[PDB]
Write an enzyme that holds these catalytic residues in place. Structure first.
Site, PDB file in Angstrom:
ATOM      1  N   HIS A 131      26.605 -15.973  17.922  1.00  0.00           N
ATOM      2  CA  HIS A 131      26.758 -16.529  16.576  1.00  0.00           C
ATOM      3  C   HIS A 131      27.597 -15.574  15.724  1.00  0.00           C
ATOM      4  O   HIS A 131      27.287 -14.379  15.629  1.00  0.00           O
ATOM      5  CB  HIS A 131      25.378 -16.740  15.941  1.00  0.00           C
ATOM      6  CG  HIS A 131      25.392 -17.628  14.737  1.00  0.00           C
ATOM      7  ND1 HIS A 131      25.222 -18.993  14.820  1.00  0.00           N
ATOM      8  CD2 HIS A 131      25.615 -17.357  13.428  1.00  0.00           C
ATOM      9  CE1 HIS A 131      25.345 -19.525  13.617  1.00  0.00           C
ATOM     10  NE2 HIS A 131      25.584 -18.554  12.755  1.00  0.00           N
ATOM     11  N   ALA A 132      28.656 -16.115  15.121  1.00  0.00           N
ATOM     12  CA  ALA A 132      29.577 -15.355  14.275  1.00  0.00           C
ATOM     13  C   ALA A 132      28.909 -14.595  13.120  1.00  0.00           C
ATOM     14  O   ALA A 132      28.089 -15.156  12.386  1.00  0.00           O
ATOM     15  CB  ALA A 132      30.625 -16.294  13.704  1.00  0.00           C
TER      16      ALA A 132
ATOM     17  N   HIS B 196      36.094 -17.663   7.416  1.00  0.00           N
ATOM     18  CA  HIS B 196      34.780 -17.577   6.807  1.00  0.00           C
ATOM     19  C   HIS B 196      34.284 -16.154   6.906  1.00  0.00           C
ATOM     20  O   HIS B 196      33.885 -15.571   5.911  1.00  0.00           O
ATOM     21  CB  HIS B 196      33.810 -18.509   7.533  1.00  0.00           C
ATOM     22  CG  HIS B 196      32.395 -18.388   7.064  1.00  0.00           C
ATOM     23  ND1 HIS B 196      31.907 -19.086   5.980  1.00  0.00           N
ATOM     24  CD2 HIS B 196      31.389 -17.583   7.479  1.00  0.00           C
ATOM     25  CE1 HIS B 196      30.662 -18.710   5.743  1.00  0.00           C
ATOM     26  NE2 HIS B 196      30.324 -17.797   6.637  1.00  0.00           N
ATOM     27  N   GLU B 197      34.334 -15.613   8.125  1.00  0.00           N
ATOM     28  CA  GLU B 197      33.903 -14.253   8.451  1.00  0.00           C
ATOM     29  C   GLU B 197      34.837 -13.221   7.821  1.00  0.00           C
ATOM     30  O   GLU B 197      34.380 -12.177   7.402  1.00  0.00           O
ATOM     31  CB  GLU B 197      33.872 -14.052   9.967  1.00  0.00           C
ATOM     32  CG  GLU B 197      32.851 -14.868  10.736  1.00  0.00           C
ATOM     33  CD  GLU B 197      31.429 -14.733  10.201  1.00  0.00           C
ATOM     34  OE1 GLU B 197      31.073 -13.624   9.760  1.00  0.00           O
ATOM     35  OE2 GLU B 197      30.653 -15.721  10.249  1.00  0.00           O
TER      36      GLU B 197
ATOM     37  N   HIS C 172      33.784 -12.457   4.392  1.00  0.00           N
ATOM     38  CA  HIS C 172      32.678 -11.503   4.314  1.00  0.00           C
ATOM     39  C   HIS C 172      33.227 -10.072   4.337  1.00  0.00           C
ATOM     40  O   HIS C 172      32.805  -9.212   3.570  1.00  0.00           O
ATOM     41  CB  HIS C 172      31.733 -11.664   5.501  1.00  0.00           C
ATOM     42  CG  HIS C 172      30.806 -12.827   5.396  1.00  0.00           C
ATOM     43  ND1 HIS C 172      30.089 -13.107   4.251  1.00  0.00           N
ATOM     44  CD2 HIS C 172      30.434 -13.752   6.311  1.00  0.00           C
ATOM     45  CE1 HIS C 172      29.316 -14.156   4.468  1.00  0.00           C
ATOM     46  NE2 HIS C 172      29.505 -14.565   5.711  1.00  0.00           N
TER      47      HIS C 172
ATOM     48  N   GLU D  88      29.173 -16.259   0.997  1.00  0.00           N
ATOM     49  CA  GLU D  88      29.498 -17.310   1.942  1.00  0.00           C
ATOM     50  C   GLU D  88      30.724 -18.114   1.544  1.00  0.00           C
ATOM     51  O   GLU D  88      31.410 -18.669   2.397  1.00  0.00           O
ATOM     52  CB  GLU D  88      28.312 -18.267   2.083  1.00  0.00           C
ATOM     53  CG  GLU D  88      27.030 -17.638   2.574  1.00  0.00           C
ATOM     54  CD  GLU D  88      27.204 -16.931   3.903  1.00  0.00           C
ATOM     55  OE1 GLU D  88      28.129 -17.308   4.654  1.00  0.00           O
ATOM     56  OE2 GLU D  88      26.415 -16.003   4.201  1.00  0.00           O
TER      57      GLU D  88
ATOM     58  N   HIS E 198      19.633 -19.905  12.401  1.00  0.00           N
ATOM     59  CA  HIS E 198      19.065 -19.276  11.214  1.00  0.00           C
ATOM     60  C   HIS E 198      17.539 -19.213  11.105  1.00  0.00           C
ATOM     61  O   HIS E 198      17.000 -18.380  10.370  1.00  0.00           O
ATOM     62  CB  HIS E 198      19.692 -19.914   9.966  1.00  0.00           C
ATOM     63  CG  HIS E 198      21.188 -19.839   9.949  1.00  0.00           C
ATOM     64  ND1 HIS E 198      21.975 -20.552  10.824  1.00  0.00           N
ATOM     65  CD2 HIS E 198      22.038 -19.118   9.181  1.00  0.00           C
ATOM     66  CE1 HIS E 198      23.247 -20.275  10.595  1.00  0.00           C
ATOM     67  NE2 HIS E 198      23.312 -19.406   9.604  1.00  0.00           N
TER      68      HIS E 198
ATOM     69  N   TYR F 277      24.303 -21.485   1.963  1.00  0.00           N
ATOM     70  CA  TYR F 277      25.338 -22.383   2.476  1.00  0.00           C
ATOM     71  C   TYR F 277      25.521 -23.646   1.625  1.00  0.00           C
ATOM     72  O   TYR F 277      26.625 -24.184   1.520  1.00  0.00           O
ATOM     73  CB  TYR F 277      25.061 -22.737   3.945  1.00  0.00           C
ATOM     74  CG  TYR F 277      24.986 -21.512   4.837  1.00  0.00           C
ATOM     75  CD1 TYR F 277      23.762 -21.068   5.341  1.00  0.00           C
ATOM     76  CD2 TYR F 277      26.137 -20.771   5.146  1.00  0.00           C
ATOM     77  CE1 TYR F 277      23.687 -19.928   6.129  1.00  0.00           C
ATOM     78  CE2 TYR F 277      26.068 -19.625   5.927  1.00  0.00           C
ATOM     79  CZ  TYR F 277      24.844 -19.210   6.419  1.00  0.00           C
ATOM     80  OH  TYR F 277      24.788 -18.087   7.209  1.00  0.00           O
TER      81      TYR F 277
HETATM   82  N1  LIG Z   1      30.673 -20.869  15.477  1.00  0.00           N
HETATM   83  C1  LIG Z   1      29.644 -21.015  14.397  1.00  0.00           C
HETATM   84  C2  LIG Z   1      30.020 -20.206  13.143  1.00  0.00           C
HETATM   85  C3  LIG Z   1      28.792 -19.651  12.387  1.00  0.00           C
HETATM   86  C4  LIG Z   1      29.247 -19.025  11.049  1.00  0.00           C
HETATM   87  C5  LIG Z   1      28.127 -18.555  10.101  1.00  0.00           C
HETATM   88  N2  LIG Z   1      27.436 -17.397  10.665  1.00  0.00           N
HETATM   89  C6  LIG Z   1      26.520 -16.846   9.656  1.00  0.00           C
HETATM   90  C7  LIG Z   1      25.786 -15.625  10.217  1.00  0.00           C
HETATM   91  C8  LIG Z   1      24.705 -15.150   9.242  1.00  0.00           C
HETATM   92  C9  LIG Z   1      23.989 -13.884   9.724  1.00  0.00           C
HETATM   93  C10 LIG Z   1      23.444 -13.004   8.795  1.00  0.00           C
HETATM   94  C11 LIG Z   1      22.741 -11.883   9.220  1.00  0.00           C
HETATM   95  C12 LIG Z   1      22.583 -11.637  10.580  1.00  0.00           C
HETATM   96  C13 LIG Z   1      23.130 -12.514  11.511  1.00  0.00           C
HETATM   97  C14 LIG Z   1      23.832 -13.636  11.084  1.00  0.00           C
HETATM   98  C15 LIG Z   1      27.309 -16.436   8.407  1.00  0.00           C
HETATM   99  O1  LIG Z   1      28.428 -15.896   8.545  1.00  0.00           O
HETATM  100  O2  LIG Z   1      26.808 -16.644   7.281  1.00  0.00           O
HETATM  101  C16 LIG Z   1      27.144 -19.699   9.839  1.00  0.00           C
HETATM  102  O3  LIG Z   1      25.985 -19.614  10.247  1.00  0.00           O
HETATM  103  N3  LIG Z   1      27.583 -20.758   9.151  1.00  0.00           N
HETATM  104  C17 LIG Z   1      26.687 -21.895   8.904  1.00  0.00           C
HETATM  105  C18 LIG Z   1      27.373 -23.019   8.111  1.00  0.00           C
HETATM  106  C19 LIG Z   1      28.735 -22.720   7.615  1.00  0.00           C
HETATM  107  C20 LIG Z   1      29.093 -22.383   6.334  1.00  0.00           C
HETATM  108  N4  LIG Z   1      30.478 -22.216   6.264  1.00  0.00           N
HETATM  109  C21 LIG Z   1      31.011 -22.445   7.506  1.00  0.00           C
HETATM  110  C22 LIG Z   1      32.341 -22.400   7.932  1.00  0.00           C
HETATM  111  C23 LIG Z   1      32.595 -22.678   9.253  1.00  0.00           C
HETATM  112  C24 LIG Z   1      31.556 -22.993  10.154  1.00  0.00           C
HETATM  113  C25 LIG Z   1      30.229 -23.034   9.728  1.00  0.00           C
HETATM  114  C26 LIG Z   1      29.944 -22.760   8.382  1.00  0.00           C
HETATM  115  C27 LIG Z   1      26.193 -22.479  10.234  1.00  0.00           C
HETATM  116  O4  LIG Z   1      26.953 -22.397  11.223  1.00  0.00           O
HETATM  117  O5  LIG Z   1      25.066 -23.034  10.273  1.00  0.00           O
HETATM  118 ZN   LIG Z   2      28.756 -16.439   6.246  1.00  0.00          ZN
END
Ligand SMILES: NCCCC[C@H](N[C@@H](CCc1ccccc1)C(=O)O)C(=O)N[C@@H](Cc1c[nH]c2ccccc12)C(=O)O
Ligand SMILES: [Zn+2]
Ligand SMILES: *[C@@H]1O[C@H](CO[C@@H]2O[C@@H](C)[C@@H](O)[C@@H](O)[C@@H]2O)[C@@H](O[C@@H]2O[C@H](CO)[C@@H](O)[C@H](O)[C@H]2NC(C)=O)[C@H](O)[C@H]1NC(C)=O
Ligand SMILES: [Cl-]
Ligand SMILES: [Cl-]
Length: 575
Positions: A314-315, A344-345, A348, A372, A471, A481
């Protein structure tokens, strides 16, 4: 009083920098290399950081915090008084740390296999089946299989997790863990504010829901879709039906106007995970914002390790508390979907870099929603047909326009009730109104109430579908989110204005706008030093969260959906 406070904050900050840096490392080490040894080292560091937290937290509580003059200092000390988990007695403390590690581990290594056949992992295998298969039974196998393996396995841990996290919250002065999490926004009216914003997006969601339900009726059969009922959760192209853009092919408003196979484009032009992040880095610098350090490219894990290691795919973005070391851990797949996630990342990371000179206690977003929202704002401009065409991923009318708006809606609009729902369920689990005997039933009650979805297979005892969502076992708050999706459109609108864009908001592309980068930078630099409405004000010229920008972005589509649904006599909702 005031001199002792200032000295305590200076001492808390320098010692925290060292201890937090050491912890993040061990944590990173386990996340990118799941073994018994890295687990042991992490659980040990947990104890360490807790000692530090207890030392300074006990000290911080000795200061009457409303008897201090300086605002910034008084703000810091109030935060340090919250020990979070470190408030738990040693025994319970370790138990909780182990439960968190176990949950996270169970989720990240779960596989779904066919007997005498190949086992499938969540990323990229099961997400691919969910995104590309158009066979009802194959989609059901993956949807049910994932919950059978990941969800059920988390159930054994959750009741104890709840008891412990709630205990820690009450030892820090809160009523329950949900009360503690909501406090991150410093907004008394939070629950009502969010309910109002949700209600505002109802017309737009209900119309999208009805339109997609009709298209699913056309493709899967009248026998599997009730035009007046909830949509089966496994048919939206996403494992959690939280975003629906992968079924764009089944719902295209104007099929005469084809769209390029972006993924095939990216693969054909040789795009790699590294290229995806480099393009994100370029968008940030085009705005006059900061580039990620050379160190980022050297230490990040931008693709799934093929060296034998097991990892948390998970990203996520990481701040190592030294103002130099920032990294991203992602099992990147080469597609548009992951390109957006990369942005997105990187959002951060940009936030980390922007507030790096702030006392570590204030090195957080104005509110979790802001953190976010940053990367998503840039991803909105990146997603425009004009911008994709410039990256040579698209070949380019009002039909292409409604087609684009539908593609964006399938993700952004569909996500609104899901993102609202997750913590509605958790807050009620935390406050005790949903017991372990009703976890799953109440989850689906909300899945139905807010998203208008139903389970393709009736749920049974032992099932714990919330656990099948990252999550939940990872204990990462979700309401951020929902906030992110509302405010990112407000930021897009303000930044576009700043950039001099005229015409429909959905046609805006802020690439290379120094005026936009300036507003984001000024707001991000504040970190958690001021209440969030000040950052909101700096970016948008006003202090409130509002659904108006998102509504305006999607207005042409709402008009098209109303005309389309009414000519087909759709009964909105799921009576
Ligand atoms: N390939 C999947 C990508 C996951 C990216 C992300 N990851 C979280 C990680 C938090 C963490 C905090 C502390 C410790 C560990 C982890 C975040 O970055 O916050 C995440 O959850 N996003 C959510 C919804 C979402 C909102 N914008 C996006 C834009 C694009 C895609 C999705 C989303 C989800 O996907 O439900
Ligand atoms: Zn995020
Ligand atoms: C209130 O204090 C903040 C913080 O001051 C710093 O931290 C103290 C604990 C102590 O170590 C001080 O010597 C530090 O200066 C002040 O905010 C800083 O203000 C300066 C100059 O305006 C600026 O360079 C810093 O970036 C600011 N830092 C932060 C965290 O905002 C602030 O000026 C004080 N306010 C009053 C009423 O004097
Ligand atoms: Cl589910
Ligand atoms: Cl949150």
């Amino acid at each position: 009083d005031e001199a002792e406070a200032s000295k305590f904050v200076e001492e808390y900050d320098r010692t925290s920098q060292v201890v937090w840096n050491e912890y993040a490392g061990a944590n990173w080490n386990y996340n990118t290399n799941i073994t018994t040894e890295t687990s042991k080292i992490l659980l040990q560091k947990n104890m360490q950081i807790a000692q530090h937290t207890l030392k300074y937290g006990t000290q911080a509580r000795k200061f009457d915090v409303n008897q201090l003059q300086n605002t910034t200092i008084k703000r810091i000390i109030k935060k340090v008084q919250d020990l979070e988990r470190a408030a738990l007695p040693a025994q319970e403390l370790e138990e909780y740390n182990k439960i968190l590690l176990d949950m996270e581990t169970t989720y990240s290594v779960a596989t779904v296999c066919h007997p005498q056949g190949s086992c499938l992992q969540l990323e990229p295998d099961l997400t691919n089946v969910m995104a590309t298969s158009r066979k009802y039974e194959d989609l059901l196998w993956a949807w049910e299989g994932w919950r059978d393996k990941a969800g059920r396995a988390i159930l054994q841990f959750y009741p104890k997790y709840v008891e412990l996290i709630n205990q820690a919250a009450r030892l820090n002065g809160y009523v329950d863990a949900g009360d503690s999490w909501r406090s991150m926004y410093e907004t008394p009216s939070l629950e009502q504010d969010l309910e109002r914003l949700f209600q505002e997006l109802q017309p737009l969601y209900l119309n999208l829901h009805a339109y997609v339900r009709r298209a699913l009726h056309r493709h899967y059969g009248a026998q599997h879709i009730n035009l007046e009922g909830p949509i089966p959760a496994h048919l939206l192209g996403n494992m959690w039906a939280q975003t629906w853009s992968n079924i764009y092919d089944l719902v295209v408003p104007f099929p005469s106007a084809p769209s390029m196979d972006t993924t095939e484009a990216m693969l054909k032009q040789g795009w790699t995970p590294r290229r995806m992040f480099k393009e994100a880095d370029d968008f940030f610098t085009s705005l006059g914002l900061l580039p990620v350090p050379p160190e980022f490219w050297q230490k990040s894990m931008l693709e799934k390790p093929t060296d034998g290691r097991e990892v948390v795919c998970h990203a996520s973005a990481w701040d190592f508390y030294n103002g130099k070391d920032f990294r991203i851990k992602q099992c990147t797949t080469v597609n548009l979907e992951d390109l957006v996630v990369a942005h997105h990342e990187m959002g951060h990371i940009q936030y980390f870099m922007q507030y790096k000179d702030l006392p570590v206690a204030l090195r957080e977003g104005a509110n979790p929603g802001f953190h976010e929202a940053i990367g998503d704002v840039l991803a909105l401009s990146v997603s425009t047909p004009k911008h994709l065409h410039s990256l040579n991923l698209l070949s380019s009318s009002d039909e292409h326009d409604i087609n684009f708006l539908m593609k964006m809606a399938l993700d952004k609009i569909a996500f609104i009730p899901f993102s609202y729902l997750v913590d509605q369920w958790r807050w009620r689990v935390f406050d005790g109104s949903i017991t372990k005997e009703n976890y799953n039933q109440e989850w689906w009650s909300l899945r139905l109430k807010y998203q208008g979805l139903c389970p393709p297979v009736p749920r049974t005892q032992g099932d714990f579908d919330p656990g099948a969502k990252f999550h939940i076992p990872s204990s990462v708050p979700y309401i951020r989110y929902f906030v992110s999706f509302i405010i990112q459109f407000q930021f897009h609108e303000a930044l576009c204005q700043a950039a001099g864009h005229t015409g429909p908001l959905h046609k805006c592309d802020i690439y290379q706008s120094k005026e936009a980068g300036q507003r984001l930078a000024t707001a991000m630099k504040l970190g958690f030093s001021r209440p969030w409405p000040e950052a909101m004000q700096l970016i948008t010229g006003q202090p409130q969260m509002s659904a108006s920008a998102m509504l305006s972005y999607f207005k042409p589509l709402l008009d098209w959906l109303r005309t389309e649904n009414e000519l087909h006599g759709e009964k909105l909702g799921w009576p």
